[PDB]
Amino acid sequence: IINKKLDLSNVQSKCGSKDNIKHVPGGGSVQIVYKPVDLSKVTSKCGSLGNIHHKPGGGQVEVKSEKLDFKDRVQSKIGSLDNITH
Amino acid sequence: IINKKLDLSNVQSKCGSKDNIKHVPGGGSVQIVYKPVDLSKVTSKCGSLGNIHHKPGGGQVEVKSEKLDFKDRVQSKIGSLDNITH
Amino acid sequence: IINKKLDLSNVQSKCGSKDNIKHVPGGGSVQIVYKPVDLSKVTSKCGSLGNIHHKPGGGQVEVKSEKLDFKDRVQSKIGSLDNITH
C-alpha cells in the first residue's frame, strides 16, 4: 500500500447551523442576526501595468424607524417558549 | 494498491442549515436574519494594460417605517411555542 | 505501508453553530448578534507596475430609531423561557 495526497483544500463543515433564533417582543423591537457563511478563494495575478480591483459587496442591513408611538399599554405574558422533554 | 490524490477543492457542507427562526411580536417589530451561504472562487489574471473590475453585488436589506401608531393596548399572551417531546 | 501527505489546508469545523438566541423585550429594544463565519484564502501576486486593490465589503448593521414614545405601561411577565427536561 502506498497512500499519497496533497491536501490544498478549503473546508467549512457544519458551520453556522442549528441556530435557534427567537424574537418575542411586546412591541417596538428589532432583532438582527447577521450570520453569513462565506468561503472565498481569490488568486489575483497582476503583471505589466494592469489593474485588478476586487471589491465584491458585503451584506448591508438597515432598519429605520422615523416615528413610532404606543398610546396604551404594551404587555407580554409568557408562560414558556420552546419546551423540550425526553 | 497505489492511492494518489491532489485535493485542491473548496467545500461547504451542512452550512447554514436547520435554523429554527421564530418571530412572535405583539406589534411594531422587525426580525432580520441575514444568512447567505456563499462559495466564491475568483482567479482574475490581468496582463499588459488591462483592467479587471470584480464588483459583484452584496445583499441589501432595508426596512423603513415612516409613521406607525398603536392607539390601544398591544398584548401578547403565549402559553408556549414549538414544543418537542420524546 | 507508506502513508505520505502534505496538509496545506484551511478548515473551519462546527464553528458558529447551535447558538440559542432569545430576545424577549417589553418594548423599545434592540438585539444584534453579528456572527459571520468566514474562511478567506487570498494569494495576490503583483509584478512590474501593476496594482492590486483587494477591498471586499464587510457586514454593516445599522439600526436607527429617530422618535419612539410609549405613553402607558410597558410590562413583561415571564414564567419561564425555553425549558428542557430529561
Residue numbers in the entry:
A (entry chain B), B (entry chain C), C (entry chain A): 277 to 362
Authors' own words:
The formation of amyloid filaments through templated seeding is believed to underlie the propagation of pathology in most human neurodegenerative diseases. A widely used model system to study this process is to seed amyloid filament formation in cultured cells using human brain extracts. Studying templated seeding in cultured cells, and determining the structures of the resulting filaments, can thus provide insights into the cellular aspects underlying neurodegenerative diseases.
Although the resulting filament structures differed from those of the brain seeds, some degrees of structural templating were observed.
